[PDB]
Structure formats: structure tokens, C-alpha cells
Amino acid sequence: DRQIKIWFQNRRMKWKK
């Protein structure tokens, strides 16, 4: 039940990087 939150982090990871 986390895929719905990771399906974006993998595309916005640069937000923190």
C-alpha cells in the first residue's frame, strides 16, 4: 500500500537530491 506513494517519489526524487 506504498506503491501509490512511490509511483511519484521515483519521478520527483530530484526534489531532495
Side-chain angles (χ1 to χ4, degrees):
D1 237 84
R2 183 125 165 282
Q3 292 255 236
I4 79 299
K5 290 286 126 95
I6 78 91
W7 81 322
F8 237 68
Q9 81 183 229
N10 248 75
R11 314 182 118 192
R12 66 137 174 171
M13 46 161 178
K14 71 185 184 162
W15 286 30
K16 70 93 98 112
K17 253 176 210 297

